């Protein structure tokens, strides 16, 4: 019926929405199996066909769509693809009308991330998971291969913009409180967990896409995030998020020190120096975030007072000795800067750089019978 309603939109068009109405009850009946993607794609088709809709369904669908994210765990991967394609279809159907488009997408992505961060973090109807959706998420932003087929009878950048606006209203919404009763005593640790969930799920979907979509925010977004950083300049999440942001910025090459450009650079250098001098009181899982940020800056801004960046970098390798990714990213930043910045300014602290480079130098079922192995179907520091 869902694929048939469009032809039915020709003869007995007033029947289409008619049956559509009853389908709403069905999904309400479906509220309280895994047949959700069928509903999603059918309603996507009919709403592509339908042009007149009772607005009472607008919140319901908002409640309905998020449900499938709620049901996304315990899925099989195949109908995960089915439901994600159905999501693409419903978005394309609702994109016809701009107002409903923007408001519905805003509220649904907002509630979705609410439930996503509602899933608690680990510490040492089946039980669901939270890390799955990011795979979903990459398909959400890599969705040209389906919008082309639907346009047969840009938009991912619209998804990118909606996501950026959502995460903006998230980070401005939630604010964290704590006590110490050097010391820490969170007062809303559940909000801490939600925040770190948000960070851990975004700092990977943001960079895999294009900051060219993020460009309308480069000066603004980071600013407020820096603003957020200035609220509690002792939270690792700020450092990770801005680190992803500066990776994206050097990906798009925003550093040419525009008034916004120079303001960005000034805030960057001042805050980087401040954190590079206050790292003294910062420890692991916080000082790690600090150092990973400090190396993540490009050459252009850090040309001023390279010296202040040396010791933490020193630390970033000796602690990078104990934690390989830290040394790895620090080495990438250092080789980058050496390529861009001249040796002369780097010359004085070469006798400083080399001592912290001594690390990584002092070191040294399934039978023959054909079974089309499931292990085959299952699919460091030396570097």
């Amino acid at each position: 019926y869902g694929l048939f309603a469009g032809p039915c939109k020709v003869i007995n068009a007033k029947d289409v929405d008619f049956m559509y109405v009853e389908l709403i009850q069905r999904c309400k009946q479906m509220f309280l199996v895994y047949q959700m993607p069928s509903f999603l794609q059918s309603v996507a088709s009919v709403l592509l066909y339908l042009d007149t809709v009772p607005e009472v369904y607008t919140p319901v669908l908002e409640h309905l769509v998020v449900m499938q994210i709620d049901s996304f765990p315990q899925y099989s991967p195949k109908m995960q693809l089915v439901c994600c394609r159905a999501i693409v279809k419903v978005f394309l159907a609702l994109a016809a009308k701009g107002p409903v488009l923007r408001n519905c997408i805003s509220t649904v992505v907002h509630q979705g991330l609410i439930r996503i961060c509602s899933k608690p973090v680990v510490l040492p109807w089946k039980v669901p998971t939270y890390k799955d959706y990011v795979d979903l998420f990459r398909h959400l932003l890599s969705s040209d291969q389906m919008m082309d087929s639907i346009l047969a009878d840009s938009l991912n950048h619209l998804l990118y913009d909606e996501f950026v606006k959502s995460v903006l209203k998230i980070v401005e919404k939630l604010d964290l409180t704590l006590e110490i009763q050097a010391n820490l005593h969170p007062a809303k640790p559940k909000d801490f967990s939600a925040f770190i969930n948000l960070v851990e799920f975004c700092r990977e979907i943001l960079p895999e896409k294009q900051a060219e979509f993020f460009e309308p925010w480069v000066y603004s977004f980071s600013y407020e995030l820096i603003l957020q950083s200035t609220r509690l300049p002792l939270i690792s999440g700020f450092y990770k998020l801005l680190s992803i942001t500066v990776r994206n910025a050097k990906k798009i090459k925003y550093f040419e020190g525009d008034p916004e450009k120079y303001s960005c650079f000034a805030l960057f250098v001042k805050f980087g120096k401040e954190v590079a001098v206050k790292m003294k009181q910062y420890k692991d899982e916080l000082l790690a975030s600090c150092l990973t940020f400090l190396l993540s800056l490009p050459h252009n801004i850090i040309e001023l007072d390279v010296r202040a960046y040396v010791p933490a970098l020193q630390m970033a390798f000796k602690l990078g000795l104990s934690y390989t990714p830290l040394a790895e990213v620090g080495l990438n930043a250092l080789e980058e800067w050496s390529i861009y910045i001249d040796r002369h300014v780097m010359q004085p602290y070469y006798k400083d750089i080399l001592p912290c480079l001594d690390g990584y130098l002092k070191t040294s079922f399934n039978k023959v019978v054909l079974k089309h192995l499931k292990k085959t179907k299952n699919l460091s520091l030396e570097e």
Binding site: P59, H63, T107, K190
Partner: protein
Amino acid sequence: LHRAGLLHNILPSQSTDLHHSVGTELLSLVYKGIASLDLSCKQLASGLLELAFAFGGLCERLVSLLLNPAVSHGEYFYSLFSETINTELLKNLDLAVLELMQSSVDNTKMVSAVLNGMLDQSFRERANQKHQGLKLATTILQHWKKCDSWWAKDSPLETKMAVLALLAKILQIDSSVSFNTSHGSFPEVFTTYISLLADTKLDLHLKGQAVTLLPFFLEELRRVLEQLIVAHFPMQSREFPPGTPRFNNYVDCMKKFLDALELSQSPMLLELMTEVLCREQQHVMEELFQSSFRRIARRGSCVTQVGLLESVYEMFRTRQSFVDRSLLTLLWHCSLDALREFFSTIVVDAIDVLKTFDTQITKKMGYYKILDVMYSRLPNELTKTLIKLCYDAFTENLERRRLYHCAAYNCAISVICCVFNELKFYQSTLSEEMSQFDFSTGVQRHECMAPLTALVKHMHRSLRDLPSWMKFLHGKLGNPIVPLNIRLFLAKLVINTEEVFRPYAKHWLSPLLQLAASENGEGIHYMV
């Protein structure tokens, strides 16, 4: 400067207090965006919005602007900045409230949209208070009759459910402590409410999902209850196949009613739901029936529980199934203090009735089934005698008669606990905002001997050869001449307990063995 309390040192009254410089730019820009946009221009237009709000009297102009029918565009402009509109209009006491209350005789969509924006914004307005929302609710309650295009057979079903949703948001916002019975403008909207309940044009599912607000509450109530529910279930719900559309509507409406009553614990609703369920077995999802009873038994005041129990008991006088399916859940779970009150209230009420004929027997089952459970807590002056009046009842030397025997015997097993205690028995920020948004959408092997074994365990707690009749039952089941059904009863019971008589199993092997000898209805090998 506005916080410094000055707006005319820099912009005195042009012609009125409305300095239309703000509104002209607002409307021109907000229209020209379609015939272009930016987050930058979004926040700048927001800034212009509070600049307009700094000036006075612009609210009526905004009411006019949102009514722009350019194709739509006025509702579009509202949608772009509904947030600031809510923020300003919350300060607006009822001026634009009356503006809409008059202009809405034709306008239907944007008016309801902005009303819900009002509702959800003032709901978000809770850090200091929600009394602004309460005053707004009272004002619109009075305003209700100044726009009548909805809420009658003058409007379509979509229009009716639109106001249903709006009033539901109001009720979940407003304080039900007032305007639940006669309170000023309460009857004005309440007669409307009752009339809308009578609207048979709406689907019964929609009617139920509307009336789900019933915990906020009188012959009109009950009478509309029967006259609606009669048109739903003829005699049977599972006659409609599971999963078929109308069956799904039935299950939805019944669960809505069950939860709503569970919250409201209104007695007549209890009578109705019990009786409609007390027609056929397990066709009204009797598990949720009893479980919701389990909640409501621990809920409510003891006096309320007592009155509700008396209501259903009087309603009790098939007739037996009425009490059977329902009462025991409450009795086994309601507050022990309320049990004292209710039983003391019905001591002589049951004494007399304790002493065609099938109806008599059914009532007597019920009496035994309520006295036994009431005994189970603690030991008036007459309480002494009634004990005996139970035992004789079993002692009689059509299957309902055997059910009666079991009833009397179980009641005696109960009452023998404390009496004859000796032997010789004479056989969060994130959570709250998530809920705020949920608010915005408004949607989120035969068994008859168990007490016998229980009493066996109890007497084992209080306490080879014994005049516990294990001698008597040992002889009884030792002879094979005892009937097969009786041997089945005895064996199934003794299976559940043998550790009690370990230093008697040295004899128990003898009966069972000859019972095990060529044993011969529900499947012999099971028990074998």
